[PDB]
């Protein structure tokens, strides 16, 4: 349906495998030349986007306004093939308690996993590292799915960052953090 349509569309249009130090990750291009990639992915000076070795233009580890890890490494590259502005779908108000996870990372490249009920945990520790605005979905997930895009038709919630037990945890990509950047 339209939800899976959006997922498979987003995947092929703005999602591309960014291979870096920790392996292959889901490169979520926000717009033009800026894409987001997990911090734990360890993006360096040069990354392999779809195999294409591209050097970093600006690597900004996005932390939360409460000066805590947000875990979104704003990876700005001098991107020739500009990304479509999917920032309009990035929401501050999710309203999408029904989400789908599009994994395009190390363990699952091109894997649409509907998570079902998605909620938020607020503030918690992520790999013993305090991280802000953590999303919680009751859906058993594991390593390898981190970096995946948590989205629905019309709403991009963020990216899978990890998990705790049977509850998966994603980073809440609030429109506010991206709409302001230029």
């Amino acid at each position: 349906g339209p939800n899976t349509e959006f997922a498979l569309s987003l995947l092929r249009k703005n999602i591309m495998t960014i291979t870096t130090s920790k392996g292959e990750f889901t490169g979520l291009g926000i717009h033009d030349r800026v894409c987001v990639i997990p911090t734990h992915a360890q993006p360096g000076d040069d990354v392999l986007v779809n195999g294409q070795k591209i050097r970093v233009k600006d690597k900004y580890k996005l932390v939360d306004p409460e000066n805590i890890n947000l875990e979104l490494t704003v990876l700005t590259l001098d991107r020739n093939e500009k990304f479509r502005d999917i920032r309009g779908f990035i929401s501050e108000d999710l309203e999408g308690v029904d989400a789908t996870l599009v994994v395009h990372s190390n363990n699952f490249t091109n894997t649409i996993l509907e998570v079902g009920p998605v909620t938020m945990a607020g503030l918690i520790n992520l790999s013993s590292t305090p991280t802000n605005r953590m999303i919680r979905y009751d859906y058993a997930t594991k390593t390898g799915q981190c970096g995946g895009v948590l989205c629905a038709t019309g709403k991009i919630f963020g990216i899978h960052v990890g998990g705790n037990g049977r509850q998966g945890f994603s980073a809440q990509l609030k429109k506010q953090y991206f709409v302001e950047k230029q």
Binding site: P38, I124, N125, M134, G163, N164
Partner: peptide, 6 residues
């Protein structure tokens, strides 16, 4: 929670 990176 201490959720881990995945």
């Amino acid at each position: 929670l201490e959720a881990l990176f995945q």
